[PDB]
Amino acid sequence: MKPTMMTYINEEEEMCRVILADFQTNAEKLESLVKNGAKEWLILATGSSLNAAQSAKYYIENLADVRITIEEPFNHLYYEKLSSHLDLVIGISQSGQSTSTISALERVKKEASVPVVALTSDVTSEIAEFADITLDIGSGKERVGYVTKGFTATVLTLMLTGLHFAYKTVQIDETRFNNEISAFSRAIDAIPATIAETEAFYERWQEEFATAPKFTAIGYGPTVGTCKEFETKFSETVRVPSQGLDLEAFMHGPYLEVNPQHRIFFLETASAVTERLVLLRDYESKYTPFTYTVKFGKGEDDRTLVIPTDLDEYQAPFLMILPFQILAHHIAELKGNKLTERIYTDFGVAMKSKTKPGDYA
Amino acid sequence: HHHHHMKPTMMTYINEEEEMCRVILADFQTNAEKLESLVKNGAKEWLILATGSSLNAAQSAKYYIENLADVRITIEEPFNHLYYEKLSSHLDLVIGISQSGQSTSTISALERVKKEASVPVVALTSDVTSEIAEFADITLDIGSGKERVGYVTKGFTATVLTLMLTGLHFAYKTVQIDETRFNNEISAFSRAIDAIPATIAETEAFYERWQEEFATAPKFTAIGYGPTVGTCKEFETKFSETVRVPSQGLDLEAFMHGPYLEVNPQHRIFFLETASAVTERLVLLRDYESKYTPFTYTVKFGKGEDDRTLVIPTDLDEYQAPFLMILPFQILAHHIAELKGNKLTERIYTDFGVAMKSKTKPGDYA
């Protein structure tokens, strides 16, 4: 039997337990390159790796004295200038085989003396050549190309690395450090219940998904990274048009597209701007009956998928993606998309975007 | 006087672009000087705060400006910026852009910058008397006048041109390009403006040739790279608002890390082709996807391979290209929307901006 996305989703709980138990050693490796701190970071990543970076960015910036810029690497190589104020560069590629990410790091290594870290699931892959250190996201080899556990591993590894960096640079104290670890431990404990809740939600609403012509996920701040990975996952698997959007970006064009067949997910986190999400959900629910909320802790009705733990908005993207990983798989299979039958398998090599054929079952 | 049958349409405003651009070109040195008065010691790090079509305009002009001047431009969504971003210690200039000047996100993000930092702030808008002007040191007019259709066309074009010409003048004034280059750039934009009517006509011919392929299109994609990613984002905004089927503007290489797996034989895919270091990558992708959807099209300058290419009849380089490369899509958005029966003069969701707290006032729409 070939693995499926569910194979890997079911492996996330233990994988994250291990990452949380062992994160200080990778963080120490990174810290040793920037012993006086590193105020300005550049992350070079594409696809789910870029979405992972976007998902972790504000958690890191909230705790550490750090500003993170995230750039698509092909664009970066050919069109961007390097900042003279850069203190650390991180390249992220789960496979370590995306040519754009590799090539962008090579350019940074050739042009600047800034420390370069690679983050990957295969520390012997091609990306390692152009980094001072190469760190392991802790996923192992994921043999389904519609990445689930590897995305989650990247997000958690980034967050915990930033957490430790904040502590080592004396931006937070031991109590805050430990309380953050406790939050992640509780979230990991909630993974099976989160899977169960998503199963229940899917079973309840499956008739609304079978012929849905369009999906949209709306988030804000940290959860824009979750919306981008929703987009990537749904596009690749469900294969109907799917969009992940910032709440306020939505208000300057996308709202005009809404029709009564749109299926729209609202990602709700506790924040200074939640009232704006509530206004928009109430408004759009008048025009489409196919609205859903994903949120933490509390729920009000059966159109809300309640993740049974509490995370703050910065931590939230670690677990907020999980329901969507599952829904992408289940809705794709419902539509008859047969996800173990691979498609466009010659593309990465033909297009010069991958060093090798995908190592997928 | 409201006359229901005499309302302006997207075509009204498209048809005003040529004359509007002549006037912008005539007068560009004045706005540029106003900006330059705020950054006399130089300005290497710029932040542009803008949303929607204003953001897409910034993205469309960014690499033109960076190619001529030793400047780095960061473009940020203003709501997100206000609530989630830190300011760089190294920022030299902030530009807020809003065509109406009434987008609360952009206004509030500038307010934060005015309250927290001493960095000069410029606002670019069609209405210099609007709310955005409160939170800028100087407020510059994009030169469009009042556009009373929500699906902006001329205003978008005015913003891209105003940004490019401002950056051109900045580069020349600061002795980063020579007089020959400065004058050659003005001539390139003048030729492009003069090519607007022919570009309209070519787009009409292309639309007439392929309209049957657009009528029942369920998904559109536009693919670009470097400068033309801005054009792709404005394609996405315009098509989503008017044609109202899922419409995506994508970077060439980003397409290769997820979107390619969505392709099916109903996808209508536009390839934006400019001369560049990376055009061979676009050729590879077009040839590959043409095996899996029959609905492929190219938009390019100068000359074209076949009748599935829309040929914009002037010579613009890749950095200048986004000024004119949007024009065919503005026309196509209109025409395809109307073909689909979408009745664009019938306003929709008109309570939204005020109810959602994203606009300070109702839209001034015909």
XYZ file of C-alpha atoms in Angstrom:
727
model
C 0.000 0.000 0.000
C 1.329 3.403 -1.030
C 1.461 6.078 1.666
C -1.151 8.805 1.461
C -1.400 12.320 2.915
C -3.197 10.636 5.826
C -0.213 8.390 6.476
C 1.821 11.525 7.139
C -0.850 13.503 8.946
C -1.055 10.574 11.378
C 2.710 10.799 11.952
C 2.685 14.508 12.891
C 1.994 14.067 16.626
C 5.062 11.920 17.331
C 7.215 13.903 14.875
C 6.400 17.160 16.686
C 6.903 15.565 20.136
C 10.444 14.683 19.015
C 11.105 18.147 17.506
C 9.983 19.815 20.741
C 12.182 17.557 22.825
C 15.256 18.223 20.663
C 15.046 21.791 19.260
C 17.847 23.423 21.262
C 20.627 21.657 19.393
C 19.717 23.071 15.961
C 19.084 26.452 17.600
C 22.562 26.363 19.181
C 24.122 25.592 15.767
C 22.406 28.646 14.244
C 23.333 30.871 17.259
C 26.995 30.004 16.976
C 27.039 31.716 13.537
C 25.627 34.983 14.937
C 26.946 35.233 18.496
C 26.114 38.940 18.809
C 22.516 38.503 17.590
C 21.134 39.062 14.124
C 18.588 41.847 13.718
C 17.804 41.448 9.966
C 17.061 38.034 8.457
C 16.353 37.019 4.847
C 14.507 33.794 4.156
C 14.694 32.351 0.602
C 12.071 29.689 -0.040
C 9.358 28.759 -2.459
C 6.039 26.946 -2.335
C 5.191 25.189 0.942
C 8.629 26.200 2.345
C 7.790 29.880 1.745
C 4.327 29.329 3.260
C 6.008 27.744 6.294
C 8.303 30.703 6.726
C 5.308 33.053 6.442
C 3.526 30.968 9.076
C 6.398 31.266 11.587
C 7.584 34.838 10.829
C 5.518 36.832 13.317
C 6.036 34.332 16.155
C 9.771 34.789 15.755
C 9.569 38.586 15.447
C 7.279 38.770 18.510
C 9.850 37.160 20.783
C 13.240 37.981 19.295
C 14.830 41.246 18.256
C 14.531 40.205 14.634
C 12.982 41.417 11.391
C 12.419 38.768 8.755
C 12.055 39.347 4.986
C 10.710 36.379 2.975
C 11.564 36.295 -0.747
C 10.820 33.994 -3.642
C 14.269 32.814 -4.684
C 14.050 32.885 -8.490
C 12.785 36.464 -8.358
C 15.414 37.269 -5.729
C 18.278 35.935 -7.856
C 17.297 37.662 -11.063
C 15.636 40.907 -9.948
C 16.466 41.793 -6.310
C 19.452 43.541 -4.797
C 20.969 42.275 -1.522
C 20.385 44.632 1.460
C 23.607 46.001 3.041
C 21.860 45.599 6.435
C 21.417 41.806 6.318
C 22.696 39.708 9.273
C 21.499 36.160 8.519
C 20.174 34.290 5.482
C 18.119 31.099 5.713
C 17.276 28.930 2.695
C 14.393 26.463 3.184
C 13.628 23.502 0.944
C 12.038 20.300 2.248
C 13.591 18.176 -0.523
C 16.696 20.304 -0.748
C 16.281 19.927 -4.533
C 14.483 23.128 -5.635
C 16.861 24.819 -8.034
C 15.566 28.309 -7.421
C 16.261 28.118 -3.674
C 19.652 26.519 -4.246
C 20.704 29.073 -6.836
C 19.603 32.041 -4.708
C 21.748 30.803 -1.835
C 24.717 30.321 -4.157
C 24.368 34.000 -5.140
C 24.308 35.126 -1.509
C 27.384 32.950 -0.721
C 29.272 34.446 -3.680
C 28.349 38.097 -2.986
C 28.294 38.501 0.761
C 29.958 37.271 3.893
C 26.642 36.976 5.779
C 26.043 33.618 7.523
C 23.857 31.211 5.573
C 21.723 28.478 7.114
C 19.909 25.812 5.107
C 16.819 24.141 6.522
C 15.715 20.823 4.923
C 14.515 17.276 5.517
C 17.656 15.900 3.752
C 20.822 17.494 5.092
C 22.883 15.749 2.352
C 20.900 17.301 -0.495
C 22.105 19.912 -2.988
C 21.016 22.902 -0.841
C 23.737 22.073 1.723
C 26.486 23.090 -0.745
C 25.630 26.773 -0.415
C 25.075 27.035 3.360
C 27.503 27.405 6.300
C 25.299 25.007 8.245
C 22.450 22.734 7.173
C 19.755 21.922 9.735
C 17.189 19.143 9.763
C 13.481 20.013 10.004
C 12.937 16.622 11.697
C 10.351 15.108 9.351
C 12.232 12.253 7.715
C 11.605 11.474 4.048
C 8.000 12.226 3.104
C 7.140 10.099 0.004
C 3.915 11.964 -0.881
C 4.596 15.227 -2.780
C 1.523 16.968 -1.300
C 3.517 17.699 1.827
C 1.823 17.623 5.197
C 4.155 16.558 8.037
C 7.116 18.277 6.358
C 5.246 21.612 6.246
C 4.309 21.237 9.927
C 7.899 20.257 10.808
C 9.214 23.370 9.073
C 6.841 25.687 10.872
C 7.518 24.172 14.272
C 11.280 24.043 13.734
C 11.276 27.729 12.688
C 9.215 28.781 15.659
C 11.237 26.864 18.225
C 14.482 28.109 16.690
C 13.215 31.678 17.099
C 12.066 30.868 20.628
C 15.480 29.626 21.655
C 17.154 32.560 19.815
C 15.019 34.990 21.840
C 15.978 33.279 25.060
C 19.734 33.103 24.192
C 19.752 36.810 23.202
C 18.035 37.726 26.505
C 14.871 39.061 24.845
C 12.707 36.712 26.967
C 13.386 35.076 30.254
C 13.277 31.435 31.413
C 9.668 31.616 32.525
C 8.453 32.835 29.140
C 10.688 30.239 27.438
C 9.209 27.414 29.451
C 5.667 28.679 29.121
C 6.060 28.702 25.349
C 7.309 25.090 25.448
C 4.219 24.230 27.542
C 1.924 25.797 24.959
C 3.464 23.720 22.178
C 3.312 20.598 24.330
C -0.438 21.129 24.901
C -0.927 21.733 21.164
C 0.846 18.442 20.299
C -1.346 16.666 22.863
C -4.388 18.101 21.005
C -3.316 16.722 17.567
C -5.416 13.502 17.658
C -8.483 15.371 18.911
C -7.949 17.954 16.181
C -7.877 15.156 13.569
C -11.087 13.754 15.117
C -12.831 17.113 15.095
C -11.871 17.634 11.447
C -13.195 14.203 10.550
C -16.483 15.100 12.237
C -16.662 18.457 10.460
C -15.866 16.883 7.094
C -18.524 14.195 7.570
C -21.080 16.828 8.529
C -20.389 19.129 5.534
C -19.236 16.687 2.822
C -22.305 17.299 0.629
C -21.252 20.991 0.486
C -17.810 20.076 -0.755
C -18.517 17.534 -3.459
C -19.400 20.113 -6.158
C -17.850 23.239 -4.646
C -16.414 25.230 -7.591
C -14.168 27.514 -5.573
C -12.607 27.570 -2.107
C -11.310 30.614 -0.167
C -9.537 30.883 3.173
C -9.282 34.243 4.891
C -6.782 35.015 7.671
C -4.637 37.796 9.024
C -1.252 38.384 10.502
C 0.313 34.966 11.333
C -2.521 33.029 9.693
C -1.888 34.494 6.254
C 0.879 31.792 6.068
C -1.812 29.207 6.864
C -4.031 30.636 4.106
C -1.138 30.401 1.583
C -0.573 26.706 2.492
C -4.322 26.098 2.237
C -4.084 27.539 -1.287
C -1.099 25.375 -2.186
C -2.640 22.221 -0.763
C -6.132 22.713 -2.222
C -4.789 23.740 -5.630
C -2.599 20.604 -5.833
C -5.110 18.016 -4.576
C -8.727 19.227 -4.697
C -7.747 20.956 -7.963
C -10.588 23.446 -8.047
C -9.654 27.084 -7.861
C -8.655 27.892 -4.288
C -7.373 31.128 -2.767
C -5.771 32.064 0.538
C -6.202 35.777 1.297
C -5.413 38.385 3.882
C -8.546 39.796 5.472
C -7.965 43.393 4.346
C -6.543 42.447 0.943
C -9.892 40.683 0.397
C -11.613 44.037 0.875
C -9.904 45.591 -2.171
C -10.917 43.286 -4.972
C -11.698 39.720 -4.092
C -14.983 40.567 -2.354
C -16.414 41.573 -5.743
C -15.992 38.006 -7.022
C -18.159 36.451 -4.293
C -21.136 34.457 -5.555
C -23.559 32.138 -3.710
C -21.486 29.083 -4.635
C -18.246 30.238 -2.988
C -17.088 28.059 -0.125
C -15.314 30.385 2.322
C -13.345 29.493 5.427
C -12.695 32.155 8.068
C -9.633 31.509 10.237
C -10.352 33.126 13.591
C -7.626 33.938 16.127
C -7.656 36.137 19.193
C -6.178 39.467 18.134
C -6.570 43.264 18.010
C -8.460 42.906 14.689
C -10.809 39.918 15.277
C -13.811 42.294 15.143
C -12.940 42.928 11.484
C -13.106 39.189 10.713
C -16.483 38.892 12.503
C -17.873 41.826 10.426
C -16.709 40.197 7.172
C -18.011 36.699 8.064
C -21.423 38.109 9.028
C -21.535 40.128 5.788
C -20.513 37.323 3.416
C -22.765 34.771 5.135
C -25.671 36.741 3.676
C -24.452 36.063 0.114
C -23.140 32.458 0.336
C -24.544 29.771 2.649
C -21.216 27.877 2.409
C -19.227 29.543 5.186
C -17.126 27.879 7.833
C -14.911 28.982 10.721
C -11.758 27.297 12.074
C -10.781 28.567 15.520
C -9.248 27.561 18.873
C -10.925 26.618 22.108
C -14.504 27.800 21.819
C -17.139 27.403 19.148
C -20.679 28.629 18.793
C -22.218 26.356 16.130
C -21.714 23.341 13.906
C -20.227 25.447 11.112
C -17.196 26.106 13.332
C -14.357 23.541 13.480
C -12.966 23.958 17.017
C -9.309 23.061 17.530
C -9.450 21.842 21.185
C -6.518 23.770 22.642
C -5.517 27.314 23.088
C -2.770 28.946 21.065
C -2.196 32.647 20.685
C -2.328 34.128 17.194
C 1.466 33.890 16.779
C 1.609 30.200 17.702
C -1.679 29.364 15.933
C -0.313 28.565 12.442
C 1.474 25.502 13.815
C -1.850 23.718 14.382
C -4.264 25.786 12.302
C -3.046 24.147 9.094
C -3.860 20.635 10.294
C -7.607 20.707 9.545
C -6.868 21.939 6.032
C -4.348 19.158 5.400
C -7.079 16.687 6.180
C -9.806 18.508 4.300
C -7.626 18.795 1.207
C -7.106 15.007 1.246
C -10.746 14.118 1.996
C -12.346 16.562 -0.418
C -9.948 15.536 -3.208
C -10.824 11.886 -2.686
C -14.553 12.741 -2.520
C -14.289 14.433 -5.936
C -12.647 11.240 -7.292
C -9.165 12.710 -7.698
C -7.264 9.518 -6.781
C -4.322 11.229 -5.090
C -2.016 8.175 -5.125
C -2.042 8.465 -8.942
C 0.705 11.019 -9.570
C 0.375 13.697 -12.222
C 2.741 15.875 -14.254
C 5.610 13.762 -12.961
C 8.062 14.959 -15.618
C 7.495 18.624 -14.818
C 10.148 19.450 -12.196
C 13.000 18.088 -14.242
C 11.638 19.304 -17.617
C 11.146 22.819 -16.211
C 14.574 22.896 -14.555
C 12.847 23.607 -11.182
C 14.044 20.347 -9.547
C 17.463 18.724 -9.603
C 15.986 15.177 -9.793
C 12.731 13.253 -10.254
C 10.512 13.460 -7.207
C 11.163 10.634 -4.749
C 7.439 9.904 -4.292
C 5.600 6.581 -4.003
C -26.798 64.798 -14.091
C -27.330 61.015 -13.713
C -28.338 59.609 -17.078
C -28.625 55.796 -16.697
C -27.715 55.038 -20.335
C -24.798 57.512 -20.435
C -22.731 56.171 -17.565
C -19.003 55.921 -18.015
C -17.687 52.380 -18.405
C -14.192 50.835 -18.164
C -13.923 51.597 -21.886
C -14.637 55.289 -21.307
C -11.603 55.452 -19.050
C -9.402 53.204 -21.159
C -10.169 55.561 -23.981
C -8.969 58.509 -21.824
C -5.553 56.968 -21.059
C -3.702 58.351 -24.076
C -4.594 61.991 -23.443
C -4.170 61.573 -19.695
C -0.662 60.143 -20.129
C 0.374 63.007 -22.450
C -0.451 65.436 -19.677
C 1.343 63.319 -17.036
C 4.457 63.171 -19.253
C 4.309 66.938 -19.915
C 4.297 67.752 -16.227
C 6.300 64.963 -14.511
C 9.194 67.082 -13.391
C 6.915 68.974 -10.927
C 5.834 65.980 -8.830
C 9.363 64.598 -8.939
C 10.763 67.842 -7.537
C 8.246 67.802 -4.745
C 9.374 64.315 -3.718
C 13.081 65.186 -4.119
C 12.579 68.186 -1.741
C 11.990 65.719 1.100
C 15.064 63.542 0.522
C 17.843 66.025 -0.167
C 20.531 63.958 1.536
C 19.561 60.903 -0.593
C 17.065 58.072 -0.035
C 18.236 54.499 -0.496
C 15.528 52.531 1.391
C 11.932 53.193 0.418
C 8.735 51.662 1.778
C 5.535 51.738 -0.241
C 2.288 51.202 1.694
C -0.629 50.428 -0.612
C -3.435 47.923 -1.177
C -5.322 46.567 -4.118
C -4.611 48.123 -7.504
C -2.389 50.729 -5.793
C -0.172 47.870 -4.491
C -0.168 46.256 -7.923
C 0.863 49.619 -9.425
C 3.769 49.892 -7.012
C 4.809 46.336 -7.886
C 4.568 47.223 -11.557
C 6.960 50.195 -11.205
C 9.371 48.895 -8.550
C 12.022 47.278 -10.715
C 12.023 50.119 -13.240
C 12.913 52.521 -10.431
C 15.494 50.135 -8.860
C 17.124 49.631 -12.269
C 17.879 53.327 -12.676
C 18.509 54.506 -9.098
C 20.516 52.974 -6.174
C 17.335 52.457 -4.201
C 15.588 49.468 -2.718
C 11.841 49.516 -2.561
C 9.804 47.326 -0.144
C 6.057 47.117 -0.822
C 3.729 46.185 2.059
C 0.037 45.685 2.566
C -0.883 48.461 4.985
C -3.317 46.693 7.338
C -0.817 43.947 7.925
C 1.955 46.512 8.226
C 0.131 48.483 10.857
C -0.794 45.536 13.043
C 2.067 43.080 12.513
C 5.201 44.706 11.016
C 8.061 46.511 12.659
C 9.619 49.557 10.945
C 13.193 49.177 9.610
C 15.757 51.313 11.470
C 17.177 52.101 8.033
C 14.121 53.496 6.222
C 14.662 56.773 4.270
C 11.287 57.422 2.568
C 7.689 56.148 2.915
C 5.211 56.460 0.030
C 1.486 55.788 0.660
C -0.589 55.197 -2.483
C -4.365 55.222 -2.712
C -6.255 56.264 -5.813
C -9.297 57.443 -3.826
C -7.278 58.460 -0.781
C -10.092 56.863 1.250
C -8.717 53.379 1.981
C -8.584 53.221 5.754
C -5.808 50.608 5.813
C -3.422 52.843 3.841
C -4.435 55.936 5.829
C -3.926 54.260 9.184
C -0.592 52.706 8.217
C 0.696 56.203 7.274
C -0.619 57.615 10.551
C 1.513 55.044 12.394
C 4.586 56.038 10.438
C 3.906 59.752 11.120
C 3.479 59.121 14.863
C 6.459 56.774 15.346
C 9.188 57.850 12.952
C 10.656 61.062 11.533
C 11.052 59.594 8.013
C 9.564 61.687 5.248
C 6.197 60.582 3.932
C 4.725 61.136 0.461
C 1.112 60.307 -0.482
C 0.155 59.572 -4.063
C -3.547 59.824 -4.892
C -6.086 61.056 -7.441
C -7.662 63.346 -4.815
C -5.115 65.487 -2.979
C -7.891 66.772 -0.649
C -8.692 63.256 0.620
C -8.080 61.746 4.081
C -4.701 60.276 3.108
C -3.199 63.783 2.835
C -3.390 64.256 6.645
C -0.617 61.707 7.244
C 1.870 62.786 4.560
C 4.392 65.606 4.379
C 3.516 66.119 0.698
C 0.624 64.732 -1.355
C 1.137 64.244 -5.067
C -1.575 63.901 -7.732
C -1.402 60.839 -9.995
C -3.023 62.859 -12.756
C -6.108 60.680 -13.474
C -8.933 62.903 -12.264
C -11.964 61.300 -10.693
C -12.668 57.794 -12.039
C -16.333 57.007 -11.324
C -16.061 53.280 -12.194
C -14.812 51.049 -9.313
C -12.893 48.772 -11.688
C -10.070 51.248 -12.096
C -8.178 51.450 -15.369
C -6.871 54.894 -16.131
C -6.065 55.441 -12.447
C -3.939 52.306 -12.284
C -2.085 53.362 -15.461
C -1.608 56.912 -14.082
C -0.121 55.495 -10.884
C 2.380 53.243 -12.720
C 3.423 56.085 -15.060
C 3.679 58.636 -12.247
C 5.893 56.239 -10.213
C 8.138 55.378 -13.157
C 8.579 59.003 -14.242
C 9.193 60.119 -10.667
C 11.862 57.480 -10.303
C 13.363 58.364 -13.690
C 13.641 62.035 -12.700
C 15.083 61.066 -9.306
C 17.762 58.948 -11.041
C 18.663 61.776 -13.426
C 18.545 64.570 -10.821
C 20.859 62.578 -8.541
C 23.299 61.912 -11.419
C 22.752 58.125 -11.341
C 21.943 58.128 -15.109
C 23.218 60.491 -17.735
C 21.310 62.986 -19.907
C 21.280 60.619 -22.869
C 19.635 57.874 -20.826
C 17.117 60.319 -19.278
C 16.039 61.617 -22.659
C 15.952 58.116 -24.163
C 13.598 57.029 -21.391
C 11.271 59.978 -21.977
C 11.223 59.052 -25.678
C 10.405 55.429 -24.884
C 7.380 56.454 -22.787
C 6.292 58.997 -25.426
C 6.327 56.277 -28.125
C 4.415 53.960 -25.774
C 1.727 56.614 -25.166
C 1.440 57.181 -28.913
C 1.008 53.382 -29.322
C -2.091 53.344 -27.063
C -4.667 53.532 -29.895
C -2.915 50.789 -31.908
C -2.663 48.685 -28.763
C -6.394 49.100 -28.163
C -7.065 48.054 -31.760
C -4.803 44.986 -31.543
C -6.534 43.939 -28.309
C -9.926 44.324 -30.036
C -8.690 42.097 -32.940
C -7.368 39.511 -30.483
C -10.551 39.541 -28.449
C -12.700 39.127 -31.576
C -10.496 36.200 -32.709
C -10.681 34.312 -29.396
C -13.945 35.469 -27.788
C -15.547 32.043 -28.155
C -12.725 30.631 -26.020
C -13.386 33.199 -23.275
C -17.150 32.935 -22.953
C -17.217 29.755 -20.840
C -13.723 30.028 -19.316
C -14.008 28.869 -15.696
C -10.485 29.849 -14.601
C -7.894 32.303 -15.858
C -4.131 32.495 -15.118
C -1.588 35.122 -16.125
C 2.125 34.212 -15.781
C 4.931 36.804 -15.635
C 8.321 37.435 -14.063
C 10.288 40.295 -12.587
C 8.560 43.589 -13.524
C 5.570 41.892 -15.107
C 4.510 40.182 -11.878
C 2.883 43.536 -11.063
C 0.941 43.259 -14.329
C -0.129 39.753 -13.331
C -1.420 40.962 -9.946
C -3.462 43.678 -11.639
C -4.785 41.089 -14.091
C -5.886 39.067 -11.034
C -7.566 42.057 -9.399
C -9.353 43.221 -12.561
C -10.470 39.802 -13.746
C -11.667 38.748 -10.277
C -13.781 41.936 -9.940
C -15.357 41.971 -13.375
C -15.118 38.632 -15.175
C -15.779 37.111 -11.740
C -14.345 33.693 -12.364
C -11.263 32.539 -10.498
C -8.334 34.451 -11.947
C -4.771 34.199 -10.709
C -1.634 36.220 -11.468
C 1.558 34.250 -10.789
C 5.299 34.458 -10.840
C 6.819 32.050 -13.400
C 8.825 30.044 -10.879
C 6.173 30.181 -8.106
C 3.870 28.424 -10.646
C 6.339 25.535 -10.614
C 5.801 24.823 -6.893
C 2.106 24.181 -6.665
C -0.064 25.785 -9.330
C 1.163 23.541 -12.150
C -0.593 20.600 -10.438
C -3.989 22.335 -10.778
C -3.791 22.663 -14.578
C -6.631 21.042 -16.474
C -7.815 21.355 -20.131
C -10.228 24.161 -19.240
C -7.577 26.521 -17.880
C -7.165 29.726 -19.948
C -3.506 30.737 -19.480
C -1.865 33.982 -20.555
C 1.933 34.091 -20.821
C 3.439 37.563 -20.509
C 6.614 37.584 -22.570
C 9.344 40.209 -22.178
C 12.998 40.084 -23.293
C 15.029 39.098 -20.266
C 17.719 36.804 -18.754
C 14.959 34.244 -18.082
C 12.646 34.288 -21.103
C 13.750 30.728 -22.072
C 12.093 29.542 -18.815
C 8.756 31.050 -19.976
C 9.141 29.400 -23.431
C 9.722 25.996 -21.758
C 6.577 26.422 -19.639
C 4.348 27.609 -22.450
C 5.392 24.703 -24.650
C 4.839 22.255 -21.803
C 1.373 23.562 -20.774
C 0.195 23.839 -24.363
C 0.087 20.016 -24.353
C -2.452 20.083 -21.452
C -4.728 22.958 -22.295
C -5.615 24.299 -25.774
C -6.421 27.680 -24.254
C -3.041 29.378 -24.188
C -2.219 32.947 -25.175
C 0.807 35.209 -25.227
C 1.058 38.974 -24.731
C 4.324 40.474 -25.955
C 5.931 43.534 -27.464
C 7.158 44.070 -30.968
C 6.440 40.950 -33.006
C 4.711 37.628 -32.430
C 4.902 33.988 -33.517
C 1.253 33.383 -34.438
C -2.331 34.577 -33.952
C -2.446 33.314 -30.326
C -0.049 36.179 -29.548
C -1.312 39.683 -28.858
C 1.384 41.998 -30.153
C 1.771 45.366 -28.398
C 3.240 47.496 -31.230
C 6.058 49.339 -29.507
C 9.531 48.591 -28.148
C 9.545 48.682 -24.334
C 12.157 46.879 -22.267
C 11.079 44.513 -19.481
C 11.308 47.244 -16.823
C 9.195 49.726 -18.762
C 6.796 47.063 -20.046
C 4.275 47.110 -17.196
C 3.169 50.623 -18.144
C 1.565 49.366 -21.354
C 1.377 45.609 -20.767
C -1.672 46.014 -18.511
C -3.710 47.811 -21.212
C -4.756 44.686 -23.159
C -5.955 43.092 -19.884
C -7.998 46.139 -18.897
C -9.831 45.810 -22.244
C -10.105 42.014 -21.976
C -11.519 42.239 -18.457
C -14.215 44.569 -19.683
C -15.022 42.653 -22.842
C -15.010 39.149 -21.352
C -17.129 40.327 -18.397
C -19.700 41.828 -20.730
C -19.584 38.701 -22.929
C -20.452 36.640 -19.845
C -23.489 38.873 -19.205
C -21.982 40.424 -16.097
C -23.458 43.888 -16.772
C -20.626 45.996 -15.358
C -22.622 49.197 -15.197
C -24.820 47.446 -12.546
C -23.009 48.150 -9.242
C -22.639 45.329 -6.723
C -21.820 45.155 -3.005
C -21.982 48.984 -2.781
C -22.401 49.035 1.023
C -19.210 46.989 1.565
C -16.479 49.569 1.930
C -18.226 51.543 4.614
C -19.754 48.544 6.415
C -16.453 46.696 6.544
C -14.619 49.851 7.700
C -12.216 49.592 4.694
C -13.341 52.959 3.152
C -13.994 56.268 4.804
C -17.031 57.056 2.575
C -19.293 55.484 -0.066
C -17.573 55.123 -3.491
C -18.236 57.939 -5.920
C -19.487 55.713 -8.740
C -21.578 56.471 -11.773
